[PDB]
Amino acid sequence: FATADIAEKMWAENYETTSPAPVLVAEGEQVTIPCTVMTHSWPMVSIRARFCRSHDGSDELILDAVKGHRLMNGLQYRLPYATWNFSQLHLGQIFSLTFNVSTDTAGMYECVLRNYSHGLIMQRFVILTQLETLSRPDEPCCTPALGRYSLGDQIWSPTPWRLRNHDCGMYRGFQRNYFYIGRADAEDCWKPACPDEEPDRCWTVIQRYRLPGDCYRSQPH
Amino acid sequence: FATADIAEKMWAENYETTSPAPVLVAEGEQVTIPCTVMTHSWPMVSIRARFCRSHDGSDELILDAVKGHRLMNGLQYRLPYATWNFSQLHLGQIFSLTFNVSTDTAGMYECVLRNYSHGLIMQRFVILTQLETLSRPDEPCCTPALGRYSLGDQIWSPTPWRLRNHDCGMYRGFQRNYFYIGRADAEDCWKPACPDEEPDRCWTVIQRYRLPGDCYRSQPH
Amino acid sequence: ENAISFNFFQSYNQYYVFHMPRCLFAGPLAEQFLNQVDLTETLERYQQRLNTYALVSKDLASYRSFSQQLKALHRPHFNQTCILFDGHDLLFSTVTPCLHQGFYLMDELRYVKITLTEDFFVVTVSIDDDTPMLLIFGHLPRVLFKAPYQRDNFILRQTEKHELLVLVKKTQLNRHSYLKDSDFLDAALDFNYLDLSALLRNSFHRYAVDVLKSGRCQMLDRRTVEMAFAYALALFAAARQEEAGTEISIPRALDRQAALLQIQEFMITCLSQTPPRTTLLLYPTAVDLAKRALWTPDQITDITSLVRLVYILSKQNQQHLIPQWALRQIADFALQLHKTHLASFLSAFARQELYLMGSLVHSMLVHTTERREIFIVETGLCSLAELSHFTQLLAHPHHEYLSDLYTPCSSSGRRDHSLERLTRLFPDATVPATVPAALSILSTMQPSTLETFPDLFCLPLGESFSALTVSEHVSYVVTNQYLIKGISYPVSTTVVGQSLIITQTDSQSKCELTRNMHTTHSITAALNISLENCAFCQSALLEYDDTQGVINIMYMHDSDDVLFALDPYNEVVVSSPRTHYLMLLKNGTVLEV
Amino acid sequence: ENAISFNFFQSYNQYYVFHMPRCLFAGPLAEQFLNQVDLTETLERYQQRLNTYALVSKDLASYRSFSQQLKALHRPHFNQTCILFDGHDLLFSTVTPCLHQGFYLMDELRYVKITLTEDFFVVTVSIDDDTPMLLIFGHLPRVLFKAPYQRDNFILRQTEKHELLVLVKKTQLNRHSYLKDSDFLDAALDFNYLDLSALLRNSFHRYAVDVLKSGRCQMLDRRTVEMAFAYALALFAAARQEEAGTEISIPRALDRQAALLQIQEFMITCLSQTPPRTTLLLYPTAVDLAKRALWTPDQITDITSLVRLVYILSKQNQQHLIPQWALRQIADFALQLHKTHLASFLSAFARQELYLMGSLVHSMLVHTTERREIFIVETGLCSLAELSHFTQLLAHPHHEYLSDLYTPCSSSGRRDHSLERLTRLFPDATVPATVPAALSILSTMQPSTLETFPDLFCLPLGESFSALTVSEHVSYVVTNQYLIKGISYPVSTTVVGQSLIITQTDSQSKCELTRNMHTTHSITAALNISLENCAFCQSALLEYDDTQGVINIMYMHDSDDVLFALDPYNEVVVSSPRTHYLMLLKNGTVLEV
Amino acid sequence: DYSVRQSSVSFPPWRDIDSVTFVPRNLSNCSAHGLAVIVAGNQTWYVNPFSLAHLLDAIYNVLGIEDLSANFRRQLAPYRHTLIVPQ
Amino acid sequence: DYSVRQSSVSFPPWRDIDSVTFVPRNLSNCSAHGLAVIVAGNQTWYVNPFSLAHLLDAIYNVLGIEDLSANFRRQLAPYRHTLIVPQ
Numbered sequence A, B: 001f002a003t004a005d006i007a008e009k010m011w012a013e014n015y016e017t018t019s020p021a022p023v024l025v026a027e028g029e030q031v032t033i034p035c036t037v038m039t040h041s042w043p044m045v046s047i048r049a050r051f052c053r054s055h056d057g058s059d060e061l062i063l064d065a066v067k068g069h070r071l072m073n074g075l076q077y078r079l080p081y082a083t084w085n086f087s088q089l090h091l092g093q094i095f096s097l098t099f100n101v102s103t104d105t106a107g108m109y110e111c112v113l114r115n116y117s118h119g120l121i122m123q124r125f126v127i128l129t130q131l132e133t134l135s136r137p138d139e140p141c142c143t144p145a146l147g148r149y150s151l152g153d154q155i156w157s158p159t160p161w162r163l164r165n166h167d168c169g170m171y172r173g174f175q176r177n178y179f180y181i182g183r184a185d186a187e188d189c190w191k192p193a194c195p196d197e198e199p200d201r202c203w204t205v206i207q208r209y210r211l212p213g214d215c216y217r218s219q220p221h
Numbered sequence C, D: 001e002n003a004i005s006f007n008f009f010q011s012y013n014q015y016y017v018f019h020m021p022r023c024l025f026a027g028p029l030a031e032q033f034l035n036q037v038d039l040t041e042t043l044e045r046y047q048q049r050l051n052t053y054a055l056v057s058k059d060l061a062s063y064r065s066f067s068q069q070l071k072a073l074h075r076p077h078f079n080q081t082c083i084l085f086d087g088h089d090l091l092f093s094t095v096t097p098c099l100h101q102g103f104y105l106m107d108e109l110r111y112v113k114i115t116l117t118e119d120f121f122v123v124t125v126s127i128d129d130d131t132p133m134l135l136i137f138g139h140l141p142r143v144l145f146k147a148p149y150q151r152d153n154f155i156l157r158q159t160e161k162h163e164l165l166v167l168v169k170k171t172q173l174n175r176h177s178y179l180k181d182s183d184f185l186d187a188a189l190d191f192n193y194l195d196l197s198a199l200l201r202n203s204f205h206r207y208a209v210d211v212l213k214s215g216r217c218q219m220l221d222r223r224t225v226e227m228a229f230a231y232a233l234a235l236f237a238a239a240r241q242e243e244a245g246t247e248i249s250i251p252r253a254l255d256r257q258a259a260l261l262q263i264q265e266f267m268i269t270c271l272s273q274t275p276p277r278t279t280l281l282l283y284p285t286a287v288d289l290a291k292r293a294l295w296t297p298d299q300i301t302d303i304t305s306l307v308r309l310v311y312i313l314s315k316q317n318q319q320h321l322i323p324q325w326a327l328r329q330i331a332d333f334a335l336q337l338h339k340t341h342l343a344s345f346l347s348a349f350a351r352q353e354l355y356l357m358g359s360l361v362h363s364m365l366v367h368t369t370e371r372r373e374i375f376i377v378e379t380g381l382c383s384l385a386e387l388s389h390f391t392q393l394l395a396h397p398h399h400e401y402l403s404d405l406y407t408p409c410s411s412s413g414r415r416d417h418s419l420e421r422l423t424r425l426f427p428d429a430t431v432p433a434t435v436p437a438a439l440s441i442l443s444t445m446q447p448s449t450l451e452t453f454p455d456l457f458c459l460p461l462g463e464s465f466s467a468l469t470v471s472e473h474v475s476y477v478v479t480n481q482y483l484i485k486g487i488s489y490p491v492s493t494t495v496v497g498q499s500l501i502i503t504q505t506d507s508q509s510k511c512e513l514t515r516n517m518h519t520t521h522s523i524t525a526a527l528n529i530s531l532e533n534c535a536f537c538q539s540a541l542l543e544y545d546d547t548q549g550v551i552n553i554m555y556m557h558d559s560d561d562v563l564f565a566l567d568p569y570n571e572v573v574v575s576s577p578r579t580h581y582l583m584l585l586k587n588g589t590v591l592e593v
Numbered sequence E, F: 001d002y003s004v005r006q007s008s009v010s011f012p013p014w015r016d017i018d019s020v021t022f023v024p025r026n027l028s029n030c031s032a033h034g035l036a037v038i039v040a041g042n043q044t045w046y047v048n049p050f051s052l053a054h055l056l057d058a059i060y061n062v063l064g065i066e067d068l069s070a071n072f073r074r075q076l077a078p079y080r081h082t083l084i085v086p087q
């Protein structure tokens, strides 16, 4: 085989300083993952994925460092119709992945310089479609103030004005209110499917980033 | 006019944490400046330039934030044949500038989110073709160990093995040895033109970054 | 027409065919089966794949079997679905109803996920995001594998009615070495594991006591994995306990459900950041049916059964079913216990009972008054005598059940424990070596349960502090620092540069994280206090020591309690010059004794 | 054929035409001219552009004129080219031979660039990287502007033979407000500025003294800009001083060139980070011609003329022309001065002369032995008496020339000055208010000129330290910390936690920035020292004080010098218990007195 | 030997294929004791027998067709061999 | 009025243009008291007089053509007007 699963992962010191904060993207939209890696000595570059819902391990798509050919595509079983890309600026290379974000394809994506054995994580992106918030039984419904990226650790949505929320029952007395970006259908008609599990594989990372506005979320220690 | 020169600049906190270290690129090669800005609220994005040799002030190329149209191109008088680029990418826009690097087009390039008055520098790139080093009269010629980007504050070249050096007289008893990337002509035939001024507009920034290997350079305070 | 032909080339002249209707392949389950396997792979690739998965007899503990008698109104449904074995190598991915519940440890690189189905369950252990180890137990389907492998190299342990099948990459044995040991799960399988009552006593709590004593929680080790597997097996047994709907004596069902919920809560606190939202565990009797069948005749005449029932209802995420009078009676029982074991170590029965009450009030939002009245009592039993008795308790090896090791000092409102307070408690200058180190971790384990109080949910959980819900209207927080908004009386420094700060707030107001200096009112004093109509009832006292950590908070409910506490003969108050005694009245008054 | 037709449409029937040959436009001059102007813009755009540039009589100081008699073997050439006015708005960009020299202040957002041409020069002041202000002086071409503007709104000052042209964006007047003052440059233009001898005395040094006293160096202010303009004007005047090749008395040319080089060096140290590499300033006589004409007859009998000539040769970047014997004689003169003004404040003549010598040794790499012998002397004149006299000097207003304010304490190898040492020098407990504040900044201005020594270029310029080149073979560095590799004798602590560290190294070895502890040899002692053949000659002594900063290093060359120093009657040695005296000999010995 | 399948979406599902063929070792020279080929409207594909037989058996079990599978599975018996012993 | 220019490289240099024309106010209705037009192969451009005439004057001075420019510059006199007073 061209390689195996990364055995000696490493993280660049800019890994957690340059990774954009989680992003809320409307369901059914054609998101794409950008990237930019300076000219290197690594034979292979790749994009590593970890889907939030019902997934374990990692799946990676391996591109030749210079030419841009495909050497191995592990994202098959979850992204049958994803199209990659590779453009060469003599100064540095660019590669991208494109798909149709939905409930099953939200997760973390990481550019990874690669060779046969090792790897060096460089950047991370988190894609979300539904976010959990808890409301007390009688308190008025919260009202977050999502805005476009801005800068910092605030969760953001490229289309904040299409924000809509729904409630999915109770949890330890609280009422679970979920936030999502709609308008996929006309007006308020659209209502996503109720999430089938929480906390999920992405719970740890997401809850480390603040949500602008007043709202309560269970948080790590 | 669509706008004026930046009245009130700003710098992102990642400005000096994400700007790649200076790069040495052979003359006559077609470099392109990458960039990646997350979805924002700024009406206009632009690329700002400061050429090293015989230049003052700044020149801006302003693109509409979303569509990608051109609104104003100040780089004309120095880059008559440079072609820009814009690729809408729903998660976040991308734009680039391409040219044929040479003695007159080396300098600093900075992506700048823009509106009519303000601006927000986001990233910086430094392009160099000749670097100065000083050698003592009897000491044997130095030998730097340029390599590909790797990571850090070390000057780097995408093609280190094409490194060649020449001497351009004396300075306060020292002998000035210049380093450049050759092979533009067969073997050692090509010899760049002698630099006409030092320290130039780019001297302050460049000399803050180390050069791997043993060598002496006049350094800031 | 439009059928698919299967032929085997009888001869060049003519071939024999099977004319399989295409309707049999109409369902999408055919395609999603096909896309998971590359049919172009050669035998060499299949041999290579098997070369990386460690085999039972060649790399792991050898195969061995156990055999024993496996035996002790709407039925529940798995209202949740998950994709089993997504992107796996040796197994087909399928979409089925399931009970999926994931635990995420402190370390972002580790997590354990438990999945259960109708006839078998799965345990997923992940390290550093690589391919995880899988433990599968139950009735395995005939065609689970994606290629015709020899599955007899994968069943690690076989029982009378089920078998254990293990998949793990050969590179992972440098970490999951416990597989190589022949004792792995010998204590959890080698008996009638369908006997839930004996199962919990013999297998789960056995691991729980050891893990708690050794302080291995929050770390993925052999004992924790064995615990998780035992928990999953216990859940599997519950579904097997006569779902047909045989008549059940309610107290027995209450005990069974209470044990299961205790197990789940312990694992949540031992291996998870926050509880899983899934809840709605399948039980012999639906919680609504239990509520109605037990409150139509008022069949409950025992307080213990009532507290167990309320625990079941609260943990099952059905708060709206809890009436106020039952909680009032629970609070009355709590006050009874407070009067009984005042200023002394809790008897085993008291510990076991009060464990449920302490774990209850933190899992509700209705009836804040009674919950406060119970929380204050749970905090007020943490007398230094209780700490000493707990210290002596830990050294005892005869601890069958996990409940016996409960102490109110752990999960209550006091979260400022340190080795200094523990060590200085002993005049012998000696403590059983393990205990003074283990109790620190035991009492510092994080339940993080203060969100269920409107005026305190914003209080940071890291810094040491103390909380006291003395009554409905008032609520005191004692801190080394001004943490939250409200009236803040400063007190003499414990050490120069460190101050004992007392914050008084009103419960009817939202929690606020104000760190500024304001309302820094001074401490008042009174000597010949007035007890008319017991104006001092429902008050908490604190003996602040000038040159060391604060110690020994106590809560007095009635006039008799405060009379007992004041009486120096009981050693509650000593009046030494170094230490000073303070009273926190039911209203906002803070005064010196 | 192939010509271009210029026509004006005499009539529809026929038009009149000019048949201009295309050869007149064959050269690239036309093309680079056309691309700089948009021929499609309307009058509105031109009006808008002018609206942004402040005008002389409307925004700046009103126009006014001055009039005076402007008057006092191969010729040099501008061996350097630059693109004047690149990307400008009102001016055409052109490529011409020029003398281009850029200064970059401490702050990265400021820099001043000086450009000169055959008949006019340019001064560029840049802030924040916006469009820079421009001062243009000299004979201006007829068609400089890019559009038919009214240039009379831009000339700020006019002279008998030249005009001053100023361009600045209207938004920039919030910073360059000095333009609004009518006094701007009144002292640098309103006289016969071609009289260089009077020019430097009246205009440049006048600004230099004030800037140095007020400590405005490294900051872009009115005085610094006036200084830069005066320097550019002085350079312009020099080129105008009879380049035809009239006979010149060599001493006069030496004085003139020395003054110009002093000006350039002062500006380099005051307004830049590193010297501009351009050098090769055009002079009345080429340096090679001066060298050969002067060393053919050995006409330089005056030592002062010799040092001036060596300074000229060294600064002009022609090191290979300097012979060894001349430097030996310079070192002998330095020793003469050392003997003369030993342990006393330097007379004005001594200061002026030794300034050149101190600035010389730092700008060469040949003859390291003699350079060391001069550097040690330059360091050894920094006696506390010199500090006091310089302090009193700094308050005098009668300081015509910048040389008089030189002190060896500044540029020499002692770079550990602090207000504590200065303040404690006075028993009155009083120093003229501004003087102690100004002395620190004067003595802490950074030449960073230790790079010209093979064994010390490694040494960081930040940390306080001391350097002594006692001889050719040995070289001591005294520091609070182990900075460089070599033998390092520790000494008693100046304060508990801080130590006086003495490092001894051999000059013949390249240095390395080794911070490790090694060869931490102990201090030896000797009382009845042996002076046979003056084994103590060429040695430096230091009176270390235990409870304060180290002070008052001294260097003894011959036996007589050490005899004088030891004699306590001269107050060189006091022998107080607190202070201790050490000897650093020509070899590696470090010992106590 | 076997038609390379660069992508899975390229591989026809049951919606496009029309005939699946087998040839035993009696006429096939392959070391696998047989070969299998399929028919699609645009291009045929060569595929290894045992993998296809295992997939067919898995599908049959999934739909619980064992009752009706007697003759078919018996016919596939020659190709269901090559069960991967660990070596 | 004036042929819009999007990039300088598009604007012909002297290598391509073949004739430059002028029309005074006596026949032109423009407020600029005249107009000028140039011709390049299959491309004509409209340009304002005064800026152009200033450019030719600058070129003449740079090339030192004042001696030979008498008649030409005299002919450009009607268009060298409109000197930009600050208002």
Ligand SMILES: *[C@@H]1O[C@H](CO)[C@@H](O[C@@H]2O[C@H](CO)[C@@H](O[C@@H]3O[C@H](CO)[C@@H](O)[C@H](O)[C@@H]3O)[C@H](O)[C@H]2NC(C)=O)[C@H](O)[C@H]1NC(C)=O
Pocket: A115, A116, A117, A118
């Ligand atoms: C994939 O890339 C990694 C890049 O690190 C390769 O590992 C690297 O192997 C080189 C071999 O020379 C190691 O360089 C030497 O390592 C030690 C430690 O410094 C020492 O001998 C030398 O100073 C030199 O640096 C390098 O350290 C090592 N990197 C790491 C992180 O261990 C790896 O071998 C590549 N894979 C393949 C199949 O080539």
Ligand SMILES: *[C@@H]1O[C@H](CO)[C@@H](O[C@@H]2O[C@H](CO)[C@@H](O[C@@H]3O[C@H](CO)[C@@H](O)[C@H](O)[C@@H]3O)[C@H](O)[C@H]2NC(C)=O)[C@H](O)[C@H]1NC(C)=O
Pocket: B115, B116, B117, B118
């Ligand atoms: C170009 O974009 C900048 C983005 O900052 C605009 O300046 C911003 O203008 C808004 C106007 O509401 C300012 O928001 C307010 O500012 C103050 C300070 O916080 C206060 O009134 C409010 O809290 C609110 O934040 C914002 O501060 C200001 N940004 C900065 C850095 O000063 C600018 O106006 C835009 N240009 C045009 C022509 O619209």
Ligand SMILES: *[C@@H]1O[C@H](CO)[C@@H](O[C@@H]2O[C@H](CO)[C@@H](O)[C@H](O)[C@H]2NC(C)=O)[C@H](O)[C@H]1NC(C)=O
Pocket: A167, A168, A169, A194, C079, C280
């Ligand atoms: C099982 O899950 C279903 C998912 O639909 C739940 O039904 C939904 O319940 C929510 C509130 O929890 C309502 O807003 C929806 O309208 C319900 N949907 C339908 C189709 O009825 C159902 O309550 C869950 N049952 C249990 C016992 O948990």
Ligand SMILES: *[C@@H]1O[C@H](CO)[C@@H](O[C@@H]2O[C@H](CO)[C@@H](O)[C@H](O)[C@H]2NC(C)=O)[C@H](O)[C@H]1NC(C)=O
Pocket: B168, B169, B194, D079, D280
């Ligand atoms: C003026 O500049 C020219 C630029 O070519 C210098 O000529 C070069 O000098 C270097 C050494 O400095 C030699 O290596 C080159 O071979 C020279 N080139 C030619 C074409 O001769 C010249 O030395 C400079 N003169 C002065 C006085 O500085």
Ligand SMILES: *[C@@H]1O[C@H](CO)[C@@H](O[C@@H]2O[C@H](CO)[C@@H](O)[C@H](O)[C@H]2NC(C)=O)[C@H](O)[C@H]1NC(C)=O
Pocket: C530, C535, C585, C587, C588, C589
């Ligand atoms: C809290 O309750 C106590 C009960 O004693 C109140 O005590 C009174 O305090 C005032 C001064 O504040 C005295 O004049 C009264 O004599 C006290 N009453 C008695 C019965 O002793 C106290 O005031 C109350 N505090 C608040 C804020 O309501």
Ligand SMILES: *[C@@H]1O[C@H](CO)[C@@H](O[C@@H]2O[C@H](CO)[C@@H](O)[C@H](O)[C@H]2NC(C)=O)[C@H](O)[C@H]1NC(C)=O
Pocket: D530, D535, D585, D587, D588, D589
């Ligand atoms: C440096 O020179 C002095 C000159 O006095 C040397 O002094 C000698 O020191 C040794 C002990 O190190 C004594 O035994 C000798 O008697 C001294 N000699 C004389 C003539 O007094 C000193 O040793 C020299 N140091 C080095 C390192 O060479």
Ligand SMILES: *[C@@H]1O[C@H](CO)[C@@H](O)[C@H](O)[C@H]1NC(C)=O
Pocket: A028, A029, A030, A081, A099, A100
């Ligand atoms: C994805 O979405 C786009 C529109 O955003 C749509 O055209 C396309 O059919 C969808 N499906 C796939 C597989 O890309």
Ligand SMILES: *[C@@H]1O[C@H](CO)[C@@H](O)[C@H](O)[C@H]1NC(C)=O
Pocket: A083, A084, A085, A086, B087
């Ligand atoms: C890369 O993306 C561009 C649009 O950004 C698209 O035109 C192109 O086809 C893509 N390349 C591949 C190989 O899919």
Ligand SMILES: *[C@@H]1O[C@H](CO)[C@@H](O)[C@H](O)[C@H]1NC(C)=O
Pocket: B028, B029, B030, B081, B099, B100
């Ligand atoms: C730039 O360089 C490329 C080759 O790198 C060449 O084809 C092209 O003609 C050059 N000129 C311009 C204007 O880009």
Ligand SMILES: *[C@@H]1O[C@H](CO)[C@@H](O)[C@H](O)[C@H]1NC(C)=O
Pocket: A087, B083, B084, B085, B086
């Ligand atoms: C952008 O660059 C691509 C190659 O990366 C090129 O094909 C395309 O033409 C460029 N776009 C423009 C507008 O020049």
